[PDB]
Amino acid sequence: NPSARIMTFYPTMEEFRNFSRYIAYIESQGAHRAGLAKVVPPKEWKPRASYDDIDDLVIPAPIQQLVTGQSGLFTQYNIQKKAMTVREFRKIANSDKYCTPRYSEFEELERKYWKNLTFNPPIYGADVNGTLYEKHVDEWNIGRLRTILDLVEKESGITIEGVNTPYLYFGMWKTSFAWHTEDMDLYSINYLHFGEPKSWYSVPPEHGKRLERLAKGFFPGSAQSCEAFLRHKMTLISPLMLKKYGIPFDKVTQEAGEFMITFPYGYHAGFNHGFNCAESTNFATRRWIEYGKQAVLCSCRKDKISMDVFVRKFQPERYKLWKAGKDNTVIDHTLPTPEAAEFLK
Numbered sequence: 001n002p003s004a005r006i007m008t009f010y011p012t013m014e015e016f017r018n019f020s021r022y023i024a025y026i027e028s029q030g031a032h033r034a035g036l037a038k039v040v041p042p043k044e045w046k047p048r049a050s051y052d053d054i055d056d057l058v059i060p061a062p063i064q065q066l067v068t069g070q071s072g073l074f075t076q077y078n079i080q081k082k083a084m085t086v087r088e089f090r091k092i093a094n095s096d097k098y099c100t101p102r103y104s105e106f107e108e109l110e111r112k113y114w115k116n117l118t119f120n121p122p123i124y125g126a127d128v129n130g131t132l133y134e135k136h137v138d139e140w141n142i143g144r145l146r147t148i149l150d151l152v153e154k155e156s157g158i159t160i161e162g163v164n165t166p167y168l169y170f171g172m173w174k175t176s177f178a179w180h181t182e183d184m185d186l187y188s189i190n191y192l193h194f195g196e197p198k199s200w201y202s203v204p205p206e207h208g209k210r211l212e213r214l215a216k217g218f219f220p221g222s223a224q225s226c227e228a229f230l231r232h233k234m235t236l237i238s239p240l241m242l243k244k245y246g247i248p249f250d251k252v253t254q255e256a257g258e259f260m261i262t263f264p265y266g267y268h269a270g271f272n273h274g275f276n277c278a279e280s281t282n283f284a285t286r287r288w289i290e291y292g293k294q295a296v297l298c299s300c301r302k303d304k305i306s307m308d309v310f311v312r313k314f315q316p317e318r319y320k321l322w323k324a325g326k327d328n329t330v331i332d333h334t335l336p337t338p339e340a341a342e343f344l345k
């Protein structure tokens with residue numbers, strides 16, 4: 001994937017059954033180089049019958065998204081509103097105030113988003129612990145993907161909400177997620193259960209440092225405080241800004257029923273088109289472990305994954321060296337996960 005463009009795959013049900021394996025496959029095609037990729041699950045596959053009964057679901061801590069700034073640079077302050085039901089959120093989403101504007105092509109709506117995101121603060125029903133998958137569905141069950149990440153839970157007995165457990169994300173028009181990499185630069189999976197689309201921006205992992213160097217310049221105070229201020233998930237930067245400053249990036253629009261996959265150290269951002277529900281959690285492959293070792297954590301806020309588990313088991317030869325702190329591995333982002341050798345041959 002020399003261009004490092006976002007890739008789209010349409011697996012057969014056979015190809016689909018094994019998550020870890022299909023991930024390895026897509027990595028064998030260079031999907032990881034974009035930092036983000038789409039998987040269109042087979043026609044037959046459905047994680048639930050119908051989403052009719054969920055109005056009673058409780059959003060404990062909705063966040064009003066306040067966006068401060070101008071000229072393609074913005075800071076997003078998320079304000080914890082009191083709880084409300086999905087019924088209540090849905091009403092607000094579709095209200096004439098908050099309802100999505102009229103458009104023909106994505107292009108149109110994008111401009112609109114980047115012009116009006118300071119006006120009319122939206123609420124985002126995010127960080128909702130739970131899953132909309134049915135118990136019997138074994139295929140790509142975000143609840144229980146069973147990756148090597150399960151070692152954290154399995155060996156420590158530590159449950160980390162949203163990391164190894166599933167989150168629900170009820171979006172409305174203009175609700176935004178700021179440029180980020182996942183916690184510990186893990187992978188993540190996002191399934192748009194239902195509702196209007198969600199557009200994604202992506203910076204190649206092999207250009208992530210470039211984005212950091214620029215973002216530091218734009219928010220020098222933030223960076224002077226916290227080396228990894230982007231982990232605050234608060235920074236918005238415009239596509240036209242990126243063009244101005246020559247940061248490579250790509251766009252894709254997730255439709256309802258589609259999967260989006262983010263790769264280690266693959267910077268992503270985006271916005272919801274209208275009322276929708278997305279389910280998410282983080283996951284891992286052998287390849288990640290090195291990313292995990294070399295990740296730049298937030299120190300400035302209290303409240304971090306033990307890598308010792310992972311280096312011991314999957315890198316035993318470098319265990320002592322790493323503990324001695326003299327492991328000077330350099331990551332090559334072009335390289336697919338070891339597990340992909342199967343499909344390279």
Ligand code: NI
Pocket residue numbers: 180181182188262268
């Ligand atoms: Ni993300």
Ligand SMILES: [Zn+2]
Pocket residue numbers: 226228229231232298299300301
């Ligand atoms: Zn911080």
